[PDB]
Amino acid sequence: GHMNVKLKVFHAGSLTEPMKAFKRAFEEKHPNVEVQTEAAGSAATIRKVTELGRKADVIATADYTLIQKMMYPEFANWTIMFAKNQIVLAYRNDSRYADEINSQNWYEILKRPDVRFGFSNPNDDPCGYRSLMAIQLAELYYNDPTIFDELVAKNSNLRFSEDNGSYVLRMPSSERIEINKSKIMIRSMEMELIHLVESGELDYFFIYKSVAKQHGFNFVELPVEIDLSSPDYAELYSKVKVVLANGKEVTGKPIVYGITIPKNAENRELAVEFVKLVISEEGQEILRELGQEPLVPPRADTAVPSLKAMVEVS
Ligand code: MOO
Ligand SMILES: [Mg+2]
16 A cells, blocks of 8 residues: 555575565565565666666666666666675585585586586676686686686587687677587576576586575685686786677676666665665675675765765775
């Protein structure tokens, strides 16, 4: 009824567990509000607003740059950066060769004929493009130009090209992506890969460390030089770029999650309160307790007057 406001929050799949907690905390403080959350790969999440005509009060992505590239200036005009993450290679203890995989031999294990691994669709999800970026960055770190070629290029129509030191991968439209089902499985968002690994269909999957911890997966920590986790290695991460099917270019960058309130949000006032919760000490703790490092202090890419005291604007 008129005493039941619905705050619509569309978010990155990897924010599914934190969002359950933000929803419960928010509703405890606003008993007449139902936070309606929906998970999807970040680019698909943004398209709900930018292409499907749906209205969301809050958009949260796993890569803040997608808000900038896909929503400015028609649907948003600021982004707050509030959390970080790290790419790892996760598995079950009964996954093929789980007893022998480690940080030094991970790519050789994935190269074994009977081993199947997964990553999400780069056109829809940052985890997916980040997975390909990490594998290509591995060629530089391990000084082995064939790692991406053997793992991905020979099992799909996805290929990195070199252009004066940097490498670029141009994505086919999603409908034209070709995958060798004998080695790889892909899904629209990384969270969808979880059940494939749990059922035994996949042995390993590239995923965020926070999600691996939340879902009880073991994992190999990849070198900081390739795992996109540290601001201090931004110069190395920038050596790889992926051009999504929608034409937007994403460059390897330290993983930083973004949140915004779309310009056409129906319940802006409540959305401001929700964003405040996410970047408050309470929200930082919710993230930390769920195995995801919050960005402290939160930052904004431009002035955000309604939240000036909560953010650092450079
Ligand atoms: O936007 Mo994801 O958390 O890389 O589904
Ligand atoms: Mg190569």
